[PDB]
């Protein structure tokens, strides 16, 4: 109806025509307003080949305000809280209404590749990243393999 639901609709056509590699996203057929997403862990990262699903929750102040985004899949990352919340600056302190769902998901894969220990949400992961890198990649890898269910 509104321009917000139509901006969500422009975001959809964006995903369909130009789906970024290793991401997918679609809103519920009834509710344009809520979106299923999933990222694939890029090559050469310890999250390699994962199939992590994501929930985006919008409202009527978009593209002005971003949705709330949380991973559904079990996660192990310094920039991820135990409830799915993500410590990404482009979503918390550097958002621009030009950003679409495609851009949001692309940045999250960029983060799977570049963990930011400087804003640690999950302590365990920010530490293992630095102290016991092998125990870290082991933890993340069991995460990746449960993602496959």
């Amino acid at each position: 109806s509104t321009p917000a639901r139509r901006r969500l609709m422009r975001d959809f056509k964006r995903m369909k025509e130009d789906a970024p590699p290793g991401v997918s996203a679609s809103p519920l057929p009834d509710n344009v307003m809520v979106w299923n997403a999933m990222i694939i862990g890029p090559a050469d990262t310890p999250y390699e080949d994962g199939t992590f699903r994501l929930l985006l929750e919008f409202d009527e102040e978009y593209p002005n305000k971003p949705p709330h985004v949380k991973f559904l899949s079990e996660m192990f990352h310094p920039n991820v809280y135990a409830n799915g919340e993500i410590c990404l600056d482009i979503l918390q302190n550097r958002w621009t209404p030009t950003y679409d769902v495609a851009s949001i998901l692309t940045s999250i894969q960029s983060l799977f590749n570049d963990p930011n220990p400087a804003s640690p949400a999950n302590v365990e992961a920010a530490t293992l990243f630095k102290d016991h890198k092998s125990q870290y990649v082991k933890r993340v890898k069991e995460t990746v393999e449960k993602s496959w269910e």
Partner: protein, 160 residues
């Protein structure tokens, strides 16, 4: 589905199955590589233990003769215990047995000095020998592992 299409629900399960195989294959290659390192260790155990039974036979022989040439009761007792063929006792008494050999094998203060010297020599040799056997085993392991991976990598190569 065509690349100019959004990834569908069948596509996701397909990607996951191919990833599952790749995980299986990696754990399977790593496991068969372990299979080879184990079979090799088993062969080397067979070989070193054959060699040890044989040289212990020699030690038991040596222990009977030094037992014969002994003056003091303690010496005779040690010699007979070694002649029994115990593998732990030879290790522990390695120094006293060497001293006994040096004392009886030969026809003042300088003799005791050369005894001290050759006990040290025997112990440095024991160390050199351990390190030599372990380095031989290590290089056999590297060789076996190279032969294992290279073959899989070449099967892949002809699978062009």
């Amino acid at each position: 589905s065509d690349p100019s299409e959004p990834l569908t629900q069948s596509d996701v399960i397909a990607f996951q199955k191919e990833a599952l195989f790749r995980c299986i294959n990696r754990r399977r290659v790593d496991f068969e590589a372990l299979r080879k390192q184990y079979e090799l260790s088993r062969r080397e155990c067979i070989d070193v233990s054959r060699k040890l039974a044989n040289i212990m036979a020699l030690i038991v022989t040596l222990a009977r003769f030094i037992e014969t040439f002994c003056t003091d009761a303690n010496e005779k007792q040690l010699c007979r215990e070694i002649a029994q063929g115990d593998e732990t006792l030879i290790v522990q008494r390695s120094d006293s047995f060497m001293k006994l050999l040096t004392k009886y094998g030969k026809p003042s203060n300088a003799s005791d000095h050369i005894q001290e010297l050759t006990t040290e020599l025997k112990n440095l040799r024991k160390s050199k020998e351990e390190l030599f056997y372990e380095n031989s085993q290590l290089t056999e392991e590297i060789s076996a592992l190279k032969e294992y991976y290279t073959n899989i990598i070449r099967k892949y190569d002809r699978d062009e």
